[PDB]
Design a protein around this ligand. Structure first.
Ligand SMILES: [Ca+2]
Length: 421
């Protein structure tokens, strides 16, 4: 059995800085004591600086254990757990490889709920963003049964340059968005981020070689609002790639429930070999939502980074199977896969959208249910079933073997299928 965090001087309270005590537990487990295991019994554990995870350690937390984020330093990350060293900006360090870390149970309160004004986080006034994990250059990482409360315009989890990562049976509740944020900064806030390892993408380290993430599964988890703040913008994805980034591959997103996102459940550019299967996406009406995007939304959005100069490795091998969407927002698309402008040099291909079910019961629906745009070869769109809305399927400017077979369309007002030239 495990090194207890209390034995190392963590006090259960709102108030005492437990950073050191917790770090000391971890450092001892790292050596092999308590057999790599660390246990957090019931409490609220305030940390006022970053805690470092260590190779071959396994943390388990009581259901009534919370980690409370009290990192409140100007020009400094406010991320509770990192898999490598960070002190201050401009003192970044290469992160060596780390492996075999597991983290299980309890809450992390990322503590970013807004002030009564809505310009800054109540308890963490000096910060620019809050979040729970920065996983860079790691292997075999399990995050399981955890409740993630209230990131402040930030990524609850960042998975950068990391292999064999699992997110299981967790919940993500609350993303806090200042009134002042422009749309471009809002939609870059994925709650779980899966990205190549670059300094621009992952500013916590020196690693800049663009190494991919690999074999990354997000499953059996729930994403929505909290009591203290509104709905996640984008549950899972990424919004950056370049000629030097190697594309995150074998990405499985399965059996999750994306409850009323502002923008997306899954939105990404630069992935290869992804599976989005048996998920549930709900989107409520503007009126029943704390957060809502007036420029509109797309629950699955496999899109193409804005570059007109380079031949990018754009999305390939995306499978979107057996999901179900209930949409009551007239402004929301269920499924979008795109090369967004004819001006982009890369190709998007091997795209299969199958056995999905969409109930769109919105009033005066302004959007198509499924949109495939500039897909170059191997496109299958099959045995999907679509209940309600204006247009059904739209396939636009697509070359190659295109299979469209045995879809069903019900009580749609506008065009079922629609091929555009
Ligand atoms: Ca520091």
């Amino acid at each position: 059995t495990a090194l207890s965090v209390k034995d190392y001087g963590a006090v259960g309270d709102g108030i005492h800085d437990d950073r050191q005590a917790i770090q000391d537990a971890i450092d001892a487990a790292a050596q092999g004591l308590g057999g790599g295991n660390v246990y957090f019994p019931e409490g609220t554990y305030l940390v006022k600086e970053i805690v470092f995870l260590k190779s071959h350690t396994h943390l388990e937390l009581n259901e009534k254990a919370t980690i409370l984020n009290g990192i409140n330093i100007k020009n400094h990350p406010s991320i509770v757990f990192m898999t490598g060293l960070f002190t201050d900006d401009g003192a970044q360090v290469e992160w060596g490889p780390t492996e075999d870390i597991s983290y299980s149970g309890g809450t992390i309160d990322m503590n970013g709920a807004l002030n009564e004004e809505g310009t800054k986080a109540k308890n963490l006034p000096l910060i620019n963003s809050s979040g729970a994990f920065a996983i860079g250059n790691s292997n075999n990482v399990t995050i399981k049964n955890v409740t993630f409360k209230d990131s402040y315009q930030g990524h609850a989890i960042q998975i950068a340059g990391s292999k064999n990562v699992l997110v299981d049976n967790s919940r993500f509740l609350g993303q806090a968005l200042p009134k002042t944020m422009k749309d471009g900064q809002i939609i870059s806030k994925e709650s779980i981020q899966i990205e190549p390892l670059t300094r621009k993408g992952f500013p916590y380290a020196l690693n800049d070689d663009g190494k991919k993430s690999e074999n990354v599964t997000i499953q059996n988890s729930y994403f929505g609002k909290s009591d203290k703040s509104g709905e996640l913008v984008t549950a899972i994805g990424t919004h950056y790639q370049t000629l030097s980034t190697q594309n995150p591959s074998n990405i499985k997103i399965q059996n999750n429930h994306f409850d009323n996102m502002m923008y997306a459940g899954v939105r990404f550019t630069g992935f290869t070999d992804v599976l989005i299967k048996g998920n549930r996406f709900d989107k409520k009406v503007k009126g029943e939502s704390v957060h809502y995007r007036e420029s509109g939304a797309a629950l699955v959005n496999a899109y193409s980074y804005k570059n007109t100069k380079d031949l990018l490795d754009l999305n390939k091998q995306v499978v979107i199977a057996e999901n179900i969407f209930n949409i009551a927002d007239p402004k929301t698309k269920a499924i979008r896969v795109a090369k967004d402008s004819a001006e982009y040099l890369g190709k998007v291909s091997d795209i299969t959208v199958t056995k999905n079910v969409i109930n769109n019961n919105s009033k005066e629906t302004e959007q198509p249910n499924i949109e495939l745009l500039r897909v170059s070869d191997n496109l299958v769109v099959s045995e999907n079933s679509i209940f309600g809305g204006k247009e059904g399927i739209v396939i636009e400017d697509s070359k190659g073997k295109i299979t469209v077979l045995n879809n069903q369309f019900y009580n749609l007002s506008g065009k079922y299928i629609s091929f555009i030239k």
